[PDB]
Amino acid sequence: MRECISIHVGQAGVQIGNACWELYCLEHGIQPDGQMPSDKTIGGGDDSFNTFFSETGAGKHVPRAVFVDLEPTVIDEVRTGTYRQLFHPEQLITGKEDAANNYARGHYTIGKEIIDLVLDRIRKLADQCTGLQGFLVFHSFGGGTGSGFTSLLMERLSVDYGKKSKLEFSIYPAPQVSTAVVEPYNSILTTHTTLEHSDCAFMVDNEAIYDICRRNLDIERPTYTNLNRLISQIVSSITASLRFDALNVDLTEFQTNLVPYPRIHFPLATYAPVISAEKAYHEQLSVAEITNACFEPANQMVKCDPRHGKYMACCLLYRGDVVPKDVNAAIATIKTKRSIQFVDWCPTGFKVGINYQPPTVVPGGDLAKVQRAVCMLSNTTAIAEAWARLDHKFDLMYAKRAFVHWYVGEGMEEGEFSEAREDMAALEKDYEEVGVDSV
Amino acid sequence: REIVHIQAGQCGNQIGAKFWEVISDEHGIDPTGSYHGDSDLQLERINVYYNEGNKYVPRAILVDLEPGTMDSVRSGPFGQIFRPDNFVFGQSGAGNNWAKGHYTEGAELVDSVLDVVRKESESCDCLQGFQLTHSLGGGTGSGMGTLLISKIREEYPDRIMNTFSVMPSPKVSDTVVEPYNATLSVHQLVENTDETYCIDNEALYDICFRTLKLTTPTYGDLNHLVSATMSGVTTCLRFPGQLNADLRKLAVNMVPFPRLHFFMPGFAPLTQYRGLTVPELTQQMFDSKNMMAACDPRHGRYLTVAAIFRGRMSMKEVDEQMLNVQNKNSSYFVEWIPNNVKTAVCDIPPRGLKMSATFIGNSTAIQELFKRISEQFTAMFRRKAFLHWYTGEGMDEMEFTEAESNMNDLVSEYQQYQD
Ligand SMILES: COc1cc([C@@H]2c3cc4c(cc3[C@@H](Nc3ccc5[nH]ncc5c3)[C@H]3COC(=O)[C@H]23)OCO4)cc(OC)c1OC
Ligand SMILES: Nc1nc2c(ncn2[C@@H]2O[C@H](COP(=O)(O)OP(=O)(O)OP(=O)(O)O)[C@@H](O)[C@H]2O)c(=O)[nH]1
Ligand SMILES: Nc1nc2c(ncn2[C@@H]2O[C@H](COP(=O)(O)OP(=O)(O)O)[C@@H](O)[C@H]2O)c(=O)[nH]1
Ligand SMILES: [Mg+2]
Ligand SMILES: [Mg+2]
Ligand code: NA
């Protein structure tokens, strides 16, 4: 019950979804053929892992997700990858042409071709579910598939599934790994479009993840593989309440607390401890250490200063050998030392959950296995800085209407650009309003 | 005079389950429903909460919008004793939204539940009324609970309605939106309950943390004080004696004015082999640190008070202690209600205690509790924070405004009489 269908749009979506799924197999004891020896129930069951993994007569535990990419290349490696047996052919959907980094191409010119087939596969998965809970969409703002097709699929899911949940894992563009000059355009436009169709959006800045790997993992030039593996750890901590089940707290309750107002649905995420296998050897990280780490600004997935802003919610999702008592101490300590300012309308509390299932690392990973990890999600107004930066780039190119012709030829109109930007400016003012102290 | 017990939601189902276990022990009923008590007292009024292969079955209906909570109870020690048909739950869950329970996803199951209730009420020879357990600050029992109360009141408008309502607290909170759910529930109860025992999840913690010295109290800890308090208040109903209290008489003697039906429970010994002295029990019973509501009686004035002492003890010494308290604390007793305090003694002591004391008081101090909730509501509601989760269900800010107001009036009323 409470099944979740996972949707992975674009190259980034797809790859990050291959990271995640592998880690989830490793955590649940699912083998690459899908056979989970631990699971005695064959063809079905009600286990937490069944919300993300469906079962078959043979005992094979198929992932509940669909990989869509307008170029075959990325999903092709999945088709031929180690976990190719786990997935099912229909679940992998690939066209023949990419959106050449163009939102317009991916939303209209190309997307329209595959959109109906995609929704079709989702619908099949939806019928398998006894009580579907919502969708998990993974994409990148910068790419044409990750922006234009992703918004299209968001609208379609709104219509066809009504107000069912729709969470998101949006890859904030990072100049270090930038692939297109026009990525700020696609970012604004997709953010504008999906803002009304997303219940809760988690952004991950490639730059921030790139830094974390170089620093904590001592990687000279982190690859998309490094990022993805770190990303999957974050994702797994967030979804761990769903896939696993006394102290564990459903992410819904966190959601009811991380969205004070519909437009404010972007929470910041900070994970700990990211450590190399040498450094983790002969070092034990306390609940207090990992907890500090959460409040450390260099450990956050998005680059922003929480101090510059105010907290509207702050949740701590732990996993591993943790006990309430230690979590209470560490929190208090933090308090004594940190400046966790809260909006006046919001209660200055930390919602916690402890999932005793310990964390797992993919073999050959650069992440050392730890006995405890934590990932704090916070609704601080600092997130706006993000938008700003982006927006500012968008404004720079758009004043000289650069690359704008590429959008217009696909059929878009400058109105869409200006409208999208206005909405971002409103969102930024909304953050400022929520921080203002009550009269 | 059977009492139809009804437990809704996680909290409601957890505390109610222990309550059954406790009173089953005292009444010598094991998990299978068979009886092995050494005294007939146990069987003399067992029908107040049980129906009889010479086995007693609790007269309890379990209600939840998610199976999990009810499935745990079924797996619990006494899970067998609870009648299987009385288990009544759905799968949607209430996502901690009064709305989702009082409007959207409860309107369905409510009917199913009313049917079991109807069945229990039919078998009952003389229906005393209904007993309900729930957490005012959640979703199923906060919202759906108050909905069932209203439905129940329409079908059985001649029956007493009593609720053990678990006031939410920041110390033990689950969601930021708990004040909202509490304020809505409070107003429901003000109108559709004759008796409401306010069990603040705050105090319980405190007691545990401070007094009982528990650094990290779990929900079980709090529940343990709750079950004890429950057994206390319900003693006079369960066990025969000089004062065979009943729901109606209980309301007739402790409720000077309708809206004022909210009581501060108190228990001692707050748990031990050293039985307390009748003076000790009496000083702890009225001790703030022994009340399950987080209000100071000294800050208000006792409209009415009712005490019970279980266990072998000197009835005379008991009466002397009570008299002393009243005489030393005359200022905390309303003059306009002559003889506003009364005590009763039961021979059968609580389980594992040589003797105990339970306190039930309609103190004007109870307003503190509602003021706390009202401030919270005000804080968030001034900025409309999180309101979209309710507006999405079809609710309207006006309704939040109304409930906010009513709870303020009720606070005012308690003060008026206080002064
Ligand atoms: C503490 O003990 C209890 C007292 C009561 C109330 C009650 C509450 C009061 C009070 C007196 C009485 C008393 N009223 C009564 C009734 C008939 C009489 N006949 N002749 C005399 C006489 C007196 C109880 C006898 O029945 C009740 O339900 C009544 O003074 C201010 O508050 C209910 C109980 O259940 C929960 C209870 O257990 C804990
Ligand atoms: N973190 C992370 N970011 C990625 C990854 N792969 C691509 N990106 C980011 O995605 C952006 C490009 O997005 P894509 O996924 O390739 O775009 P697309 O979805 O294939 O759309 P097309 O232009 O039509 O091919 C770049 O700015 C990268 O920073 C990844 O594997 N991990
Ligand atoms: N004393 C006590 N309080 C509880 C318990 N379970 C939940 N609560 C409180 O109930 C409130 C949340 O309501 P919940 O039980 O989850 O209601 P539901 O939607 O119907 O399940 C929170 O304030 C908790 O403080 C319990 O077992 N004992
Ligand atoms: Mg591509
Ligand atoms: Mg709950
Ligand atoms: Na429904």
> For an interface test with B, which of A245, A253, A431 has the most B Cβ atoms less than 10 Å from its Cβ?
A253
Q: Which residues of A touch B384 (CB under 8 A)?
A: 261
The sign of the dihedral angle between the CA atoms of B288, B293, B297, B298 is positive
Same domain, A206 and A347: no
Nearest in space to B355 (alpha carbons), one of B289, B292, B279: B279
Residue B30 DSSP one-character state: -
Tokens 């400046």 belong to residue: A339
List, in order, residues 6 or more apart from A210 with CB less than 8 Å away.
A174, A176, A177, A222, A227
Give me B120's structure tokens. 């229990």
Burial-class residue B54 by CB neighbours within 10 Å (0-12, 13-18, 19+).
exposed
The sign of the torsion formed by the CA atoms of B135, B138, B143, B144 equals negative
Query: Based on the domain organization, do A156 and A69 belong to the same domain?
Result: yes
All residues with CB under 5 Å from ion ligand 4: A 11, 71, 98
Nearest of B308, B299, B327, B193 to residue B255 by alpha carbon: B193
User: Cβ contacts (< 8 Å) between B174 and chain A: which residues?
Assistant: 253, 351
DSSP B103: I
Q: Measured between CA atoms, how close is B216 to chain A, in angstroms?
A: 6
**Residue B174 to residue A24: CA distance in whole angstroms:** 28
Same domain, A42 and A123: yes
Angle of helix B219-233 relative to helix B201-209, nearest 10 degrees?
A: 110
Q: Where would I find the H helices in B76-218? A: 98-99, 107-123, 145-155, 178-192, 201-209
d(CA A428, CA A390): 12
Ligand 1 midpoint to CA B245 (Å)? 5
Q: How far is Cα A110 from Cα A95, in angstroms, rounded to an integer? A: 9
Q: What CATH number is given to the structural domain containing A45?
A: 3.40.50.1440
Distance (Å, rounded) from C-alpha B240 to C-alpha B244? 6
Answer yes or no: do A315 and A395 share one domain: no
- Under 8 Å CB-to-CB from B114, ≥6 apart: which residues? B148, B151, B152, B155
| DSSP characters over A260-286 | SSTT----EEEEE----HHHHTT----
Q: What CATH number does residue A395 fall under?
A: 1.10.287.600
Same domain, A60 and A149: yes
Residue B356 has phi, psi (to 5 degrees) of -145, 175
Residue B265 belongs to what H/E stretch? strand B262-268
Q: Please tell me if residue A325 touches chain B, with a CB cutoff of 8 Å.
A: yes
Q: Which chain B residues have a beta carbon less than 8 Å from that of A1?
A: 91
Solved using: X-ray
Read off the CATH number of the domain in which A332 is found: 3.30.1330.20
Number of compact structural domains in chain A: 3
What's the CA gap between A365 and A381, in Å, rounded?
Answer: 34
Q: How many CA atoms lie within 13 A of A157 on its CB side?
A: 29
Report residue B24 CA to chain centroid gap.
18
A261 at the B interface (CB within 8 A)?
A: yes
Contact indicator for B356, B267 with CB cutoff of 8 Å: yes
For every residue of A139-176, DSSP letters joined together read EESSSHIIIIIHHHHHHHHHHHHTT-EEEEEEEE--GG
Nearest by Cα to B71 from B89, B57, B85 = B89
Structure tokens at B256: 């000077």
For B1, half-sphere exposure in the C-beta direction (CA atoms, 13 angstrom radius) is 14
B341 is in an annotated binding site: no
Cβ of B387 closer than 6 Å to ligand 1, yes or no, is no
Interface contact flag, B382 A345, Cβ < 8 Å: yes
**Residue type at position A433:** E
From the DSSP assignment, how many helices (H) and strands (E) are in chain A? 16, 12
Instruction: Name the residue range of residue A192's domain.
Output: 1-267
> Is the separation of the CB atoms in A32 and A82 below 8 Å?
yes
Largest CA distance in chain B: 61
Give distance in angstroms: CA of A321 to centre of ligand 1.
52
SS (H, E, C) B50-85: EECCCCCEECEEEEECCHHHHHHHHHCHHHHCCCHH
Q: Tokens for A149, please give them.
A: 């097709």
**φ, ψ (nearest 5 deg) of residue B360:** -125, 110
The CB density around residue B162, as the number of other CB atoms within 10 Å, is 25
Q: Which two tokens stand for residue B133?
A: 């357990």
A30 to chain B, closest Cα gap in Å: 25
- Residue B65 CA to residue B108 CA, distance in Å, equals 10
Q: Which two tokens stand for residue B373?
A: 């909730």
A347 reaches B (C-beta below 8 A):
yes
Q: Which residues of A60-89 are buried (b: 16+ CB within 10 A; e: fewer)?
A: bbbbbbbbbbbbbebbeebeeeebeebbbe
The two beta strands, B262-268 and B355-363, are antiparallel
- Per the listing, tokens 């450990």 go with A299
Query: No. of H helices and E strands in chain B?
Result: 16, 12
Phi, psi of B400 (to 5 degrees): -55, -45
Measured distance CA(A236)–CA(A255) in Å, rounded: 16
For residue A437, count other CB atoms closer than 10 A to its CB: 8
In angstroms, rounded to a whole number, what is the distance separating the alpha carbons of residues A438 and A75? 50
Quick one: DSSP state of residue A34? S
User: Two tokens at A131?
Assistant: 């009580």
Residues A281 and A309 in one domain: yes
The residue among A341, A360, A382 that closes a domain is: A382
**Structural contact between residues B2 and B127, judged by C-beta atoms closer than 8 angstroms:** yes
Alpha-carbon distance values, B238 to B49, B56, B331 (Å) = 7, 14, 33
Phi and psi at B57, nearest 5°, equal -115, 130
A304 and A364 co-located in one domain? yes
A261, B174: Cβ pair inside 8 Å?
Answer: no
Contact between A345 and B383 using a beta-carbon 8 Å cutoff: yes
A435, closest residue in chain B (CA to CA): B383
* Beta partners for residue B362, in sequence order: B304
Say if residues B153 and B192 touch (Cβ distance below 8 Å): yes
Cβ-count burial A350-359 (b if 16+ within 10 Å, e if not): bbbbbbebeb
A60 Cα–ligand 1 center, Å = 65
- Please give the structure tokens belonging to residue B388: 């979209």
Instruction: For residue A349, list chain B residues with Cβ-Cβ distance below 8 A.
Output: 170, 173, 176
In whole angstroms, give the CA distance from residue A303 to residue A218.
Answer: 19
What whole-number distance in Å separates Cα of residue B28 and Cα of residue B46? 10
Helices (H), B193-338: 201-209, 219-233, 235-238, 247-254, 278-285, 315-328
* Last residue of one domain, picked from the residues A267, A291, A326: A267
At a CB cut-off of 8 Å and minimum separation 6, what does B31 contact? B24, B77, B78, B79, B80, B81
Q: Ligand 6 centroid to A237 CA: how many Å?
A: 30
A17-34 per-residue burial string, b: 16 or more CB within 10 A, e: under 16: bbbbbbbbbebbebbeeb
Which residues have a beta carbon within 5 Å of ligand 5, which is an ion? B 10
Q: Do residues A235 and A339 share a domain?
A: no
- A362 CA → ligand 3 middle, Å: 38
| B332 within 8 A of B301, measured Cβ to Cβ | yes
d(CA A213, CA A217): 5
Asked whether the beta carbons of residue A261 and residue B385 sit closer than 8 angstroms, the reply is yes
Q: Write out the two tokens for B163.
A: 């609720």
Beta carbons of A347 and B173 less than 8 Å apart:
yes
Tracing tokens 């409860």 back to the chain, one arrives at B106
Q: Using DSSP bridges, classify how beta strands A65-69 and A165-172 pair: parallel, antiparallel or unpaired.
A: unpaired
Q: Which of A117, A111, A108, A119 is nearest to A161 (CA)?
A: A119
If asked whether residues A64 and A140 sit together in one domain, one would say yes
Clarify whether residues A369 and A393 are in a common domain.
Answer: no
CB contact under 8 Å between B218 and A313, yes or no, is: no
**B141: its two tokens:** 């029992």
Name the residue at shortest CA distance from atom 19 of ligand 2. Answer: A10
**Binary contact (B384, A313; C-beta < 8 A):** no
Residues A210 and A335 in one domain: no
The CA distance from A345 to B275, in Å, is 48
Residues in Cβ contact with A179 at an 8 Å cutoff, skipping those fewer than 6 apart:
A101, A142, A143
Distance, in Å, from the CA atom of A105 to the CA atom of A99, rounded to the nearest integer, reads 5
Question: Which residues, 6+ apart, have CB-to-CB distance to B87 below 8 Å?
Answer: B62, B70, B74
Cis peptide before B84 (omega within 30 of 0): no
Q: What is the CA radius of gyration of chain B?
A: 20
φ and ψ at residue B157, rounded to 5 degrees: -70, -10
Rounded to whole angstroms, how far apart are CA atoms B178 and B264? 21
Structure tokens at A187: 């970012």
Would you list the DSSP string of A351-392?
EEEEE-SPP---TT-SSPP-SEEEEEEEEEGGGHHHHHHHHH
A-B CB pairs within 8 A amount to 58
DSSP code, position B140: I
Q: Are B369 and B178 in contact (CB under 8 A)?
A: no
d(CA A135, CA A268): 20
* Cβ-Cβ contacts under 8 Å for B10 (sequence gap 6 or more): B64, B69, B135, B138, B140, B141
The answer to whether B141 is a known ligand-binding residue is yes
Q: Is the distance from CB of A300 to CB of A375 less than 8 angstroms?
A: no
Pick the residue whose CA is nearest to atom 8 on ligand 2.
A12
Using CA coordinates, name the residue in chain A closest to B392: A163
**Residues in B touching A324 (Cβ below 8 Å):** 216, 218
Q: Which residues of B touch A (CB under 8 A)?
A: 91-92, 95-96, 170, 173-177, 215-216, 218, 376, 379-380, 382-386, 388-389, 392
Residue B242 per-residue DSSP state: S
Q: Do A253 and B215 touch (CB under 8 A)?
A: no
Pick from A163, A137, A318: nearest CA to B95: A163
Q: What is the DSSP letter of B142?
A: I
Residue nearest to atom 3 of ligand 2 (CA): A12
Do both A343 and A260 map to the same domain?
no
B279 to A141, A294, B173, B310, B320: CA distances (angstroms): 73, 53, 36, 14, 9
In whole angstroms, give the CA distance from residue B103 to residue B98: 8
Tell if the CB–CB gap between B385 and A257 is shorter than 8 Å.
no
Burial class (CB in 10 A: 0-12, 13-18, 19+), A429: exposed
Residue from the list A262, A313, A324 with its beta carbon closest to the beta carbon of B216? A324
Could you tell me if A185 and A192 are in contact, meaning their C-beta atoms sit under 8 angstroms apart? Answer: no
Residue B239 per-residue DSSP state: S
List beta partners, residue A63. Answer: A53
Please give the Cα distance from B5 to B163 (Å, whole number).
10
What is the DSSP-derived secondary structure letter of residue B200?
A: -
Q: Is B358 exposed, middle or buried (0-12, 13-18, 19+ CB in 10 A)?
A: buried
**Are the C-beta atoms of A264 and A430 separated by less than 8 Å?**
yes
Residue found under tokens 């916690």: A352
d(CA B132, CA B242): 26
**Kindly report the CA angle at B276 between B274 and B278, in degrees rounded to 5?**
150
**DSSP E strand stretches across B271-372:** 302-311, 341-346, 355-363
* Residue B369, SS3 per DSSP: helix
Q: Partners of A94 in the beta sheet? A: A69
> What's the one-letter identity of residue B288?
S
The encoded tokens of residue B404 equal 């906010």
Query: Active-site residue numbers of A?
Result: 253
A345 touches chain B (CB under 8 A): yes
Residues of A in contact with B219 (CB under 8 A): none
Ligand nearest to the CA of B106: 6
Tokens representing residue A179 in the block: 């692939």
A320 annotated among ligand-binding-site residues: no
Nearest alpha carbon to residue B140 among B7, B262, B243, B257: B7
Q: Indicate the top mutation candidate among B136, B201, B218, B225 to test ligand 3's pocket, ranked by most ligand atoms within 8 A of CB.
A: B201
